[PDB]
Amino acid sequence: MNVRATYTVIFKNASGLPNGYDNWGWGCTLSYYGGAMIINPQEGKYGAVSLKRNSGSFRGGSLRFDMKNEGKVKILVENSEADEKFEVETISPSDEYVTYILDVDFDLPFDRIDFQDAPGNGDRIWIKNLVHSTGSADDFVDPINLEHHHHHH
Ligand SMILES: OC[C@H]1O[C@@H](O[C@H]2[C@H](O)[C@@H](O)[C@H](O[C@H]3[C@H](O)[C@@H](O)[C@H](O[C@H]4[C@H](O)[C@@H](O)[C@H](O[C@H]5[C@H](O)[C@@H](O)[C@H](O[C@H]6[C@H](O)[C@@H](O)[C@@H](O)O[C@@H]6CO)O[C@@H]5CO)O[C@@H]4CO)O[C@@H]3CO)O[C@@H]2CO)[C@H](O)[C@@H](O)[C@@H]1O
Ligand SMILES: [Co+2]
């Protein structure tokens, strides 16, 4: 048996929603520039992007992404069949991109990945380089595709 993780690059540079995903989000408008998904939540809506994998689910593992964000951002996953949600982490503000690699300890499969404006104050959120691994955060190695190019030596 192959014990290495499956890495799913959901998007690197975003110029729209990733192929294979719908947005079941709420209370926001999304724009795309400079390879970032830019979320502008509406004041008072506790808005979110909710990326819905149209075919299949993820299980456990970890989520990796670059984010900058004016306010706290709650990361959730959901199982749409059971309508069950799980808070992965709430991330504090940062005025520069930070790479996060977060364990997902939820014990149902998930088909929705949510980035939510936790304070409901309309703080903007920028996301790039979103990847799921079936392995742990401690075992996570960035996919070669995330490099600006890759010319193998
Ligand atoms: O169209 C495609 C598809 O749609 C299907 O229907 C989907 C729909 O598209 C989708 O949008 C919807 O998504 C749900 C999601 O499943 C829920 O988990 C989510 O729940 C939100 C909730 O809406 C928010 O109100 C709540 O907000 C919290 C906030 O997280 C928290 O930080 C805050 O606390 C405050 C507190 O209130 C203050 O007093 C003070 O203490 O400050 C704190 C912190 O600020 O409070 C907020 C308010 O309570 O967050 C939760 C969790 O994220 O809701 C969304 C939207 O409804 O899901 C449906 C499926 O059910 C169709 O079914 C399908 O046919 C169609 O094809
Ligand atoms: Co190589």
Side-chain angles (χ1 to χ4, degrees):
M1 187 171 284
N2 183 333
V3 301
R4 291 170 57 186
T6 297
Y7 290 83
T8 299
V9 176
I10 299 173
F11 58 90
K12 180 176 329 190
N13 294 311
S15 73
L17 299 171
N19 185 36
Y21 303 77
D22 289 349
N23 182 15
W24 289 18
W26 62 95
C28 311
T29 284
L30 268 71
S31 61
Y32 305 88
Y33 188 78
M37 175 182 289
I38 308 175
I39 308 173
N40 181 188
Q42 334 172 349
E43 166 85 15
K45 293 306 183 173
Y46 304 91
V49 168
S50 182
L51 297 175
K52 163 72 172 99
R53 185 176 170 124
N54 291 148
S55 188
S57 291
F58 299 111
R59 297 170 200 261
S62 51
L63 291 168
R64 171 259 187 271
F65 52 90
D66 296 346
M67 182 171 72
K68 67 170 182 184
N69 46 297
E70 289 168 340
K72 284 187 179 166
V73 176
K74 183 179 310 175
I75 310 297
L76 312 95
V77 299
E78 320 186 32
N79 179 285
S80 75
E81 178 166 59
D83 193 28
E84 180 76 4
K85 52 198 224 273
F86 178 90
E87 178 178 343
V88 178
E89 188 96 351
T90 292
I91 294 175
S92 334
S94 178
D95 62 8
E96 294 171 311
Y97 282 104
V98 174
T99 300
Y100 298 93
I101 309 179
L102 305 176
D103 287 301
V104 178
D105 291 359
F106 191 41
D107 58 26
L108 285 168
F110 61 97
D111 60 352
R112 294 174 63 183
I113 301 166
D114 303 348
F115 299 83
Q116 180 174 29
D117 181 27
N121 301 317
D123 292 311
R124 287 177 300 160
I125 308 167
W126 293 253
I127 311 168
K128 300 177 322 187
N129 299 320
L130 176 62
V131 183
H132 175 260
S133 172
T134 58
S136 73
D138 264 17
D139 290 332
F140 191 105
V141 183
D142 280 354
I144 68 177
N145 71 90
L146 283 198
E147 297 181 358
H148 287 273
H149 58 275
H150 178 76
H151 188 269
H152 188 89
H153 295 302

Short mmCIF file of all heavy atoms in Angstrom, two decimals, residues 1-63:
data_model
loop_
_atom_site.label_atom_id
_atom_site.label_comp_id
_atom_site.label_asym_id
_atom_site.label_seq_id
_atom_site.Cartn_x
_atom_site.Cartn_y
_atom_site.Cartn_z
N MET A 1 0.85 -1.21 0.00
CA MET A 1 0.00 0.00 0.00
C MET A 1 0.88 1.26 0.00
O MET A 1 1.88 1.36 0.70
CB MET A 1 -0.91 -0.03 1.22
CG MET A 1 -1.96 1.09 1.26
SD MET A 1 -3.17 0.89 2.56
CE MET A 1 -4.18 -0.30 1.96
N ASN A 2 0.45 2.23 -0.78
CA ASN A 2 1.13 3.55 -0.86
C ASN A 2 0.69 4.41 0.33
O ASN A 2 -0.48 4.75 0.46
CB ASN A 2 0.75 4.16 -2.19
CG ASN A 2 1.43 5.49 -2.45
OD1 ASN A 2 1.78 6.24 -1.53
ND2 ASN A 2 1.58 5.82 -3.69
N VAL A 3 1.65 4.78 1.17
CA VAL A 3 1.36 5.51 2.41
C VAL A 3 1.50 7.02 2.29
O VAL A 3 1.26 7.73 3.24
CB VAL A 3 2.25 5.04 3.62
CG1 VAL A 3 2.05 3.55 3.91
CG2 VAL A 3 3.71 5.36 3.42
N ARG A 4 1.91 7.50 1.13
CA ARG A 4 2.06 8.93 0.90
C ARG A 4 0.67 9.58 0.75
O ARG A 4 -0.29 8.92 0.37
CB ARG A 4 2.94 9.18 -0.33
CG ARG A 4 4.42 8.79 -0.10
CD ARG A 4 5.30 8.77 -1.31
NE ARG A 4 5.31 10.03 -1.99
CZ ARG A 4 5.93 10.26 -3.15
NH1 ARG A 4 6.65 9.32 -3.73
NH2 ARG A 4 5.81 11.41 -3.74
N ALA A 5 0.60 10.87 1.03
CA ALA A 5 -0.65 11.59 1.00
C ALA A 5 -1.08 11.90 -0.43
O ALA A 5 -0.27 12.00 -1.35
CB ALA A 5 -0.51 12.88 1.78
N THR A 6 -2.39 12.10 -0.59
CA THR A 6 -2.95 12.69 -1.79
C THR A 6 -3.05 14.20 -1.56
O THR A 6 -3.74 14.66 -0.64
CB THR A 6 -4.35 12.14 -2.08
OG1 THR A 6 -4.24 10.75 -2.33
CG2 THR A 6 -4.96 12.77 -3.34
N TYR A 7 -2.36 14.96 -2.40
CA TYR A 7 -2.44 16.42 -2.38
C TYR A 7 -3.34 16.90 -3.50
O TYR A 7 -3.14 16.56 -4.68
CB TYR A 7 -1.07 17.03 -2.57
CG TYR A 7 -0.11 16.83 -1.39
CD1 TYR A 7 0.61 15.67 -1.23
CD2 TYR A 7 0.11 17.85 -0.47
CE1 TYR A 7 1.50 15.50 -0.19
CE2 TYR A 7 1.03 17.71 0.54
CZ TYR A 7 1.74 16.54 0.68
OH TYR A 7 2.65 16.45 1.71
N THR A 8 -4.36 17.67 -3.14
CA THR A 8 -5.29 18.29 -4.08
C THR A 8 -5.05 19.77 -4.06
O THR A 8 -5.32 20.44 -3.07
CB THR A 8 -6.73 18.01 -3.65
OG1 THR A 8 -6.97 16.60 -3.64
CG2 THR A 8 -7.73 18.64 -4.64
N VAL A 9 -4.55 20.30 -5.17
CA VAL A 9 -4.39 21.74 -5.31
C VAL A 9 -5.73 22.27 -5.76
O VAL A 9 -6.16 22.05 -6.89
CB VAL A 9 -3.28 22.10 -6.32
CG1 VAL A 9 -3.20 23.61 -6.51
CG2 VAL A 9 -1.96 21.57 -5.83
N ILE A 10 -6.42 22.96 -4.88
CA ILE A 10 -7.75 23.49 -5.16
C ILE A 10 -7.62 24.75 -6.02
O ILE A 10 -8.26 24.84 -7.08
CB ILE A 10 -8.55 23.69 -3.87
CG1 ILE A 10 -8.72 22.35 -3.18
CG2 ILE A 10 -9.90 24.32 -4.16
CD1 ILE A 10 -9.36 22.41 -1.81
N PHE A 11 -6.74 25.67 -5.65
CA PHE A 11 -6.27 26.70 -6.60
C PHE A 11 -4.92 27.23 -6.21
O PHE A 11 -4.59 27.28 -5.03
CB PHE A 11 -7.27 27.86 -6.81
CG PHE A 11 -7.65 28.61 -5.54
CD1 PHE A 11 -6.93 29.71 -5.11
CD2 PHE A 11 -8.76 28.25 -4.85
CE1 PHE A 11 -7.33 30.41 -3.96
CE2 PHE A 11 -9.18 28.96 -3.73
CZ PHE A 11 -8.47 30.03 -3.28
N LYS A 12 -4.15 27.67 -7.20
CA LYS A 12 -2.86 28.31 -6.99
C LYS A 12 -3.15 29.80 -7.09
O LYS A 12 -3.50 30.45 -6.09
CB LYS A 12 -1.86 27.75 -7.99
CG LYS A 12 -0.46 28.26 -7.97
CD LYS A 12 0.37 27.45 -8.99
CE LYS A 12 -0.19 26.02 -9.11
NZ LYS A 12 0.65 25.09 -9.89
N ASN A 13 -3.07 30.32 -8.32
CA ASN A 13 -3.54 31.65 -8.62
C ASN A 13 -4.98 31.55 -9.08
O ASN A 13 -5.30 30.85 -10.02
CB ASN A 13 -2.66 32.29 -9.69
CG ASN A 13 -1.27 32.53 -9.18
OD1 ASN A 13 -1.09 33.09 -8.10
ND2 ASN A 13 -0.26 32.09 -9.95
N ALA A 14 -5.85 32.24 -8.39
CA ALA A 14 -7.27 32.23 -8.70
C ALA A 14 -7.60 33.36 -9.68
O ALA A 14 -7.36 34.54 -9.39
CB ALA A 14 -8.04 32.42 -7.41
N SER A 15 -8.21 33.01 -10.81
CA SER A 15 -8.84 34.00 -11.73
C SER A 15 -10.35 33.73 -11.85
O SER A 15 -11.06 34.30 -12.67
CB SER A 15 -8.12 34.03 -13.08
OG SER A 15 -8.49 32.84 -13.74
N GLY A 16 -10.85 32.93 -10.94
CA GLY A 16 -12.26 32.62 -10.78
C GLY A 16 -12.37 31.44 -9.82
O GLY A 16 -11.36 31.06 -9.21
N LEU A 17 -13.56 30.89 -9.67
CA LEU A 17 -13.71 29.70 -8.86
C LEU A 17 -12.95 28.56 -9.51
O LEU A 17 -12.93 28.41 -10.70
CB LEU A 17 -15.16 29.30 -8.73
CG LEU A 17 -16.09 30.31 -8.05
CD1 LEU A 17 -17.52 29.90 -8.18
CD2 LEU A 17 -15.69 30.51 -6.58
N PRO A 18 -12.36 27.68 -8.69
CA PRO A 18 -11.66 26.52 -9.21
C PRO A 18 -12.59 25.54 -9.92
O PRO A 18 -13.70 25.30 -9.46
CB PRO A 18 -11.04 25.89 -7.92
CG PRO A 18 -11.78 26.31 -6.86
CD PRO A 18 -12.33 27.71 -7.22
N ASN A 19 -12.14 24.96 -11.04
CA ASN A 19 -12.93 23.99 -11.77
C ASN A 19 -13.24 22.82 -10.86
O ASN A 19 -12.34 22.28 -10.24
CB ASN A 19 -12.17 23.41 -12.99
CG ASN A 19 -13.04 22.47 -13.86
OD1 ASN A 19 -14.25 22.67 -14.04
ND2 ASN A 19 -12.40 21.44 -14.41
N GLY A 20 -14.50 22.41 -10.82
CA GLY A 20 -14.93 21.32 -9.95
C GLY A 20 -15.55 21.77 -8.64
O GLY A 20 -15.97 20.94 -7.84
N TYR A 21 -15.62 23.08 -8.42
CA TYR A 21 -16.14 23.65 -7.19
C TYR A 21 -17.18 24.72 -7.51
O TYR A 21 -16.95 25.58 -8.37
CB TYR A 21 -14.98 24.24 -6.33
CG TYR A 21 -13.91 23.19 -6.01
CD1 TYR A 21 -12.97 22.77 -6.94
CD2 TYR A 21 -13.88 22.56 -4.76
CE1 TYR A 21 -12.03 21.75 -6.65
CE2 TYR A 21 -12.96 21.59 -4.46
CZ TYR A 21 -12.05 21.15 -5.41
OH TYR A 21 -11.15 20.12 -5.11
N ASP A 22 -18.31 24.68 -6.82
CA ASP A 22 -19.25 25.77 -6.81
C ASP A 22 -19.04 26.61 -5.53
O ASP A 22 -18.37 26.16 -4.60
CB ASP A 22 -20.69 25.25 -6.88
CG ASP A 22 -21.04 24.69 -8.25
OD1 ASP A 22 -20.29 24.87 -9.23
OD2 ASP A 22 -22.09 24.04 -8.41
N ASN A 23 -19.58 27.82 -5.50
CA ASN A 23 -19.54 28.65 -4.30
C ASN A 23 -20.91 28.68 -3.65
O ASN A 23 -21.84 29.31 -4.17
CB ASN A 23 -19.07 30.06 -4.64
CG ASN A 23 -18.97 30.95 -3.41
OD1 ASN A 23 -18.99 30.46 -2.29
ND2 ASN A 23 -18.81 32.27 -3.62
N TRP A 24 -21.05 27.98 -2.52
CA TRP A 24 -22.24 28.00 -1.71
C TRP A 24 -22.13 29.02 -0.58
O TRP A 24 -22.74 28.89 0.49
CB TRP A 24 -22.51 26.61 -1.11
CG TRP A 24 -22.95 25.57 -2.11
CD1 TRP A 24 -22.84 25.59 -3.48
CD2 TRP A 24 -23.59 24.35 -1.79
NE1 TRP A 24 -23.39 24.45 -4.01
CE2 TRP A 24 -23.85 23.66 -2.99
CE3 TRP A 24 -24.00 23.76 -0.59
CZ2 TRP A 24 -24.49 22.41 -3.03
CZ3 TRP A 24 -24.63 22.51 -0.64
CH2 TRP A 24 -24.87 21.87 -1.85
N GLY A 25 -21.32 30.04 -0.81
CA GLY A 25 -21.11 31.10 0.16
C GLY A 25 -22.31 32.00 0.29
O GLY A 25 -23.36 31.80 -0.32
N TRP A 26 -22.16 33.01 1.14
CA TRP A 26 -23.26 33.92 1.48
C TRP A 26 -22.66 35.24 1.93
O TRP A 26 -21.56 35.30 2.48
CB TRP A 26 -24.13 33.29 2.60
CG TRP A 26 -23.40 33.05 3.90
CD1 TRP A 26 -23.36 33.89 4.98
CD2 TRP A 26 -22.60 31.89 4.27
NE1 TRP A 26 -22.59 33.34 5.98
CE2 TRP A 26 -22.11 32.12 5.57
CE3 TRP A 26 -22.24 30.70 3.62
CZ2 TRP A 26 -21.29 31.21 6.24
CZ3 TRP A 26 -21.43 29.79 4.29
CH2 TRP A 26 -20.98 30.05 5.60
N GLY A 27 -23.40 36.32 1.71
CA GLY A 27 -23.07 37.57 2.35
C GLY A 27 -21.74 38.19 1.96
O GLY A 27 -21.12 38.91 2.77
N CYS A 28 -21.30 37.93 0.73
CA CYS A 28 -20.02 38.47 0.23
C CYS A 28 -20.08 38.80 -1.28
O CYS A 28 -20.97 38.32 -2.01
CB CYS A 28 -18.77 37.52 0.37
SG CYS A 28 -18.45 36.76 1.92
N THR A 29 -19.08 39.54 -1.78
CA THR A 29 -18.84 39.50 -3.22
C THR A 29 -17.35 39.08 -3.37
O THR A 29 -16.50 39.43 -2.55
CB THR A 29 -19.10 40.91 -3.68
OG1 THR A 29 -20.46 41.34 -3.79
CG2 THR A 29 -17.92 42.01 -3.68
N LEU A 30 -17.06 38.35 -4.41
CA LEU A 30 -15.72 37.82 -4.67
C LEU A 30 -15.17 38.50 -5.89
O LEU A 30 -15.87 38.68 -6.91
CB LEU A 30 -15.77 36.33 -4.92
CG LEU A 30 -15.58 35.49 -3.67
CD1 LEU A 30 -16.73 35.54 -2.72
CD2 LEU A 30 -15.26 34.07 -4.01
N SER A 31 -13.90 38.86 -5.83
CA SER A 31 -13.17 39.34 -6.99
C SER A 31 -11.86 38.59 -7.11
O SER A 31 -11.44 37.92 -6.14
CB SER A 31 -12.98 40.86 -7.00
OG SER A 31 -12.24 41.27 -5.89
N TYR A 32 -11.23 38.70 -8.27
CA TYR A 32 -10.03 37.94 -8.56
C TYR A 32 -9.03 38.85 -9.20
O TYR A 32 -9.29 39.43 -10.25
CB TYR A 32 -10.32 36.76 -9.49
CG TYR A 32 -11.41 35.88 -8.94
CD1 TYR A 32 -12.76 36.14 -9.23
CD2 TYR A 32 -11.12 34.83 -8.09
CE1 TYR A 32 -13.77 35.37 -8.69
CE2 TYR A 32 -12.10 34.07 -7.57
CZ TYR A 32 -13.43 34.32 -7.86
OH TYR A 32 -14.38 33.51 -7.29
N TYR A 33 -7.90 39.03 -8.55
CA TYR A 33 -6.84 39.87 -9.07
C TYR A 33 -5.51 39.44 -8.50
O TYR A 33 -5.40 39.10 -7.32
CB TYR A 33 -7.10 41.33 -8.70
CG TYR A 33 -6.14 42.28 -9.39
CD1 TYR A 33 -6.32 42.64 -10.72
CD2 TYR A 33 -5.03 42.78 -8.71
CE1 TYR A 33 -5.41 43.50 -11.36
CE2 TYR A 33 -4.13 43.64 -9.33
CZ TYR A 33 -4.33 44.00 -10.66
OH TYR A 33 -3.44 44.85 -11.28
N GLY A 34 -4.49 39.45 -9.34
CA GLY A 34 -3.16 39.13 -8.88
C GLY A 34 -3.02 37.69 -8.41
O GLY A 34 -2.10 37.38 -7.65
N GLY A 35 -3.90 36.82 -8.89
CA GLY A 35 -3.96 35.43 -8.48
C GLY A 35 -4.65 35.18 -7.14
O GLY A 35 -4.73 34.06 -6.70
N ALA A 36 -5.15 36.22 -6.51
CA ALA A 36 -5.87 36.06 -5.24
C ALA A 36 -7.37 35.99 -5.47
O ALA A 36 -7.91 36.73 -6.30
CB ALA A 36 -5.58 37.23 -4.33
N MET A 37 -8.02 35.16 -4.67
CA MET A 37 -9.46 35.25 -4.43
C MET A 37 -9.61 36.30 -3.32
O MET A 37 -9.07 36.14 -2.22
CB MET A 37 -9.98 33.91 -3.97
CG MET A 37 -11.44 33.90 -3.57
SD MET A 37 -12.01 32.31 -2.99
CE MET A 37 -12.02 31.46 -4.43
N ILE A 38 -10.34 37.37 -3.61
CA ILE A 38 -10.56 38.49 -2.70
C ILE A 38 -12.01 38.49 -2.27
O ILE A 38 -12.92 38.64 -3.12
CB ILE A 38 -10.20 39.81 -3.34
CG1 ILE A 38 -8.80 39.73 -3.93
CG2 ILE A 38 -10.25 40.94 -2.30
CD1 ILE A 38 -8.39 40.95 -4.69
N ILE A 39 -12.25 38.30 -0.98
CA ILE A 39 -13.58 38.22 -0.44
C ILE A 39 -13.87 39.55 0.23
O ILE A 39 -13.12 40.01 1.09
CB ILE A 39 -13.68 37.09 0.61
CG1 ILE A 39 -13.16 35.75 0.09
CG2 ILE A 39 -15.11 36.97 1.12
CD1 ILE A 39 -13.09 34.67 1.20
N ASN A 40 -14.97 40.17 -0.17
CA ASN A 40 -15.46 41.38 0.45
C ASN A 40 -16.77 41.05 1.14
O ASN A 40 -17.84 41.08 0.50
CB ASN A 40 -15.60 42.53 -0.54
CG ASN A 40 -16.09 43.78 0.16
OD1 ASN A 40 -16.41 44.78 -0.50
ND2 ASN A 40 -16.05 43.79 1.50
N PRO A 41 -16.72 40.70 2.42
CA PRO A 41 -17.94 40.37 3.16
C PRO A 41 -18.77 41.61 3.40
O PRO A 41 -18.26 42.70 3.61
CB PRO A 41 -17.42 39.78 4.47
CG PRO A 41 -15.96 39.58 4.28
CD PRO A 41 -15.53 40.59 3.29
N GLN A 42 -20.07 41.42 3.41
CA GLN A 42 -20.99 42.50 3.73
C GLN A 42 -21.08 42.67 5.24
O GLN A 42 -21.33 41.70 5.96
CB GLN A 42 -22.38 42.22 3.14
CG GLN A 42 -22.42 41.31 1.91
CD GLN A 42 -23.83 40.89 1.45
OE1 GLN A 42 -24.83 41.10 2.14
NE2 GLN A 42 -23.89 40.28 0.27
N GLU A 43 -20.97 43.91 5.70
CA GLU A 43 -21.15 44.30 7.10
C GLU A 43 -22.43 43.65 7.62
O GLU A 43 -23.49 43.76 6.99
CB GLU A 43 -21.23 45.85 7.21
CG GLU A 43 -21.75 46.39 8.54
CD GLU A 43 -20.68 46.51 9.60
OE1 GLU A 43 -19.48 46.46 9.26
OE2 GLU A 43 -21.04 46.68 10.78
N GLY A 44 -22.34 43.00 8.77
CA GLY A 44 -23.50 42.44 9.44
C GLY A 44 -23.96 41.08 8.99
O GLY A 44 -24.85 40.50 9.61
N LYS A 45 -23.37 40.52 7.93
CA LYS A 45 -23.83 39.25 7.37
C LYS A 45 -23.03 38.03 7.86
O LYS A 45 -23.43 36.89 7.62
CB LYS A 45 -23.85 39.28 5.85
CG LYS A 45 -24.90 40.25 5.25
CD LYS A 45 -26.32 40.05 5.76
CE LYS A 45 -27.28 41.01 5.05
NZ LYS A 45 -28.69 40.71 5.41
N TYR A 46 -21.89 38.26 8.50
CA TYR A 46 -20.96 37.18 8.83
C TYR A 46 -20.74 36.31 7.59
O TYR A 46 -20.83 35.07 7.62
CB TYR A 46 -21.45 36.37 10.04
CG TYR A 46 -21.68 37.23 11.25
CD1 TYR A 46 -22.91 37.80 11.51
CD2 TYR A 46 -20.64 37.50 12.13
CE1 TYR A 46 -23.10 38.62 12.62
CE2 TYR A 46 -20.81 38.32 13.23
CZ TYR A 46 -22.04 38.87 13.47
OH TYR A 46 -22.23 39.67 14.59
N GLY A 47 -20.44 36.98 6.49
CA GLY A 47 -20.37 36.35 5.19
C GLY A 47 -19.18 35.42 5.03
O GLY A 47 -18.19 35.48 5.76
N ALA A 48 -19.27 34.54 4.05
CA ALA A 48 -18.22 33.56 3.78
C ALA A 48 -18.21 33.13 2.33
O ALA A 48 -19.24 33.12 1.65
CB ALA A 48 -18.44 32.32 4.65
N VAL A 49 -17.04 32.72 1.88
CA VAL A 49 -16.93 31.85 0.72
C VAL A 49 -17.09 30.41 1.21
O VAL A 49 -16.59 30.07 2.28
CB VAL A 49 -15.61 32.06 -0.01
CG1 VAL A 49 -15.32 30.98 -1.04
CG2 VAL A 49 -15.78 33.31 -0.74
N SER A 50 -17.80 29.58 0.46
CA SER A 50 -17.95 28.16 0.82
C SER A 50 -17.74 27.34 -0.44
O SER A 50 -18.64 27.23 -1.28
CB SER A 50 -19.33 27.94 1.42
OG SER A 50 -19.53 26.59 1.82
N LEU A 51 -16.54 26.84 -0.62
CA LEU A 51 -16.19 26.10 -1.80
C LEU A 51 -16.74 24.69 -1.66
O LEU A 51 -16.36 23.95 -0.75
CB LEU A 51 -14.70 26.03 -1.98
CG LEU A 51 -14.04 27.40 -2.19
CD1 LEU A 51 -12.55 27.27 -2.23
CD2 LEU A 51 -14.55 28.10 -3.42
N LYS A 52 -17.64 24.32 -2.57
CA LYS A 52 -18.34 23.05 -2.58
C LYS A 52 -17.76 22.17 -3.67
O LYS A 52 -17.89 22.52 -4.86
CB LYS A 52 -19.83 23.30 -2.80
CG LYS A 52 -20.66 22.09 -3.24
CD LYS A 52 -20.82 21.15 -2.12
CE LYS A 52 -21.81 20.03 -2.49
NZ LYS A 52 -21.08 18.86 -2.90
N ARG A 53 -17.12 21.06 -3.32
CA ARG A 53 -16.58 20.12 -4.30
C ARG A 53 -17.76 19.41 -4.95
O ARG A 53 -18.51 18.73 -4.27
CB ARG A 53 -15.62 19.12 -3.64
CG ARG A 53 -14.94 18.20 -4.66
CD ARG A 53 -13.92 17.28 -4.08
NE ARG A 53 -13.46 16.26 -5.03
CZ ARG A 53 -12.20 16.03 -5.38
NH1 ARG A 53 -11.18 16.77 -4.92
NH2 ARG A 53 -11.92 15.08 -6.27
N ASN A 54 -17.94 19.59 -6.27
CA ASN A 54 -19.15 19.15 -6.94
C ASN A 54 -19.29 17.64 -6.97
O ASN A 54 -20.41 17.13 -6.97
CB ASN A 54 -19.22 19.73 -8.34
CG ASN A 54 -19.46 21.25 -8.33
OD1 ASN A 54 -18.99 21.96 -9.21
ND2 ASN A 54 -20.18 21.74 -7.32
N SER A 55 -18.16 16.95 -7.01
CA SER A 55 -18.11 15.49 -7.11
C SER A 55 -17.06 14.96 -6.11
O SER A 55 -15.84 15.22 -6.27
CB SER A 55 -17.74 15.08 -8.54
OG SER A 55 -17.86 13.68 -8.73
N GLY A 56 -17.56 14.27 -5.07
CA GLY A 56 -16.73 13.65 -4.05
C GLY A 56 -16.45 14.52 -2.84
O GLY A 56 -16.91 15.66 -2.74
N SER A 57 -15.74 13.91 -1.89
CA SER A 57 -15.42 14.52 -0.60
C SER A 57 -13.92 14.36 -0.29
O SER A 57 -13.18 13.58 -0.93
CB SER A 57 -16.29 13.96 0.58
OG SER A 57 -17.70 14.33 0.56
N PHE A 58 -13.49 15.18 0.65
CA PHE A 58 -12.21 15.04 1.33
C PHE A 58 -12.40 14.34 2.66
O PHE A 58 -13.47 14.40 3.24
CB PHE A 58 -11.61 16.43 1.58
CG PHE A 58 -11.33 17.22 0.32
CD1 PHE A 58 -12.08 18.35 0.02
CD2 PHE A 58 -10.32 16.86 -0.54
CE1 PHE A 58 -11.81 19.09 -1.12
CE2 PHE A 58 -10.04 17.61 -1.66
CZ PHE A 58 -10.78 18.73 -1.95
N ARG A 59 -11.34 13.74 3.18
CA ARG A 59 -11.38 13.15 4.50
C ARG A 59 -10.15 13.53 5.28
O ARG A 59 -9.03 13.29 4.83
CB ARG A 59 -11.44 11.62 4.41
CG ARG A 59 -12.61 11.04 3.77
CD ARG A 59 -12.40 9.56 3.55
NE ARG A 59 -13.30 9.24 2.57
CZ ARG A 59 -14.44 8.71 2.77
NH1 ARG A 59 -14.73 8.21 3.98
NH2 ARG A 59 -15.25 8.54 1.75
N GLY A 60 -10.38 14.09 6.46
CA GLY A 60 -9.33 14.42 7.42
C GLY A 60 -8.22 15.22 6.79
O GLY A 60 -8.43 16.11 5.97
N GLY A 61 -7.00 14.90 7.19
CA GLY A 61 -5.82 15.52 6.64
C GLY A 61 -5.62 16.96 7.12
O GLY A 61 -5.80 17.28 8.28
N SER A 62 -5.23 17.81 6.18
CA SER A 62 -4.84 19.16 6.48
C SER A 62 -5.16 20.07 5.31
O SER A 62 -5.26 19.64 4.15
CB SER A 62 -3.34 19.21 6.83
OG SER A 62 -2.52 18.59 5.87
N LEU A 63 -5.35 21.35 5.65
CA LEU A 63 -5.57 22.41 4.67
C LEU A 63 -4.43 23.40 4.74
O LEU A 63 -4.07 23.87 5.82
CB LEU A 63 -6.88 23.13 4.94
CG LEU A 63 -8.14 22.32 4.69
CD1 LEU A 63 -9.36 23.00 5.26
CD2 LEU A 63 -8.36 22.05 3.21
#
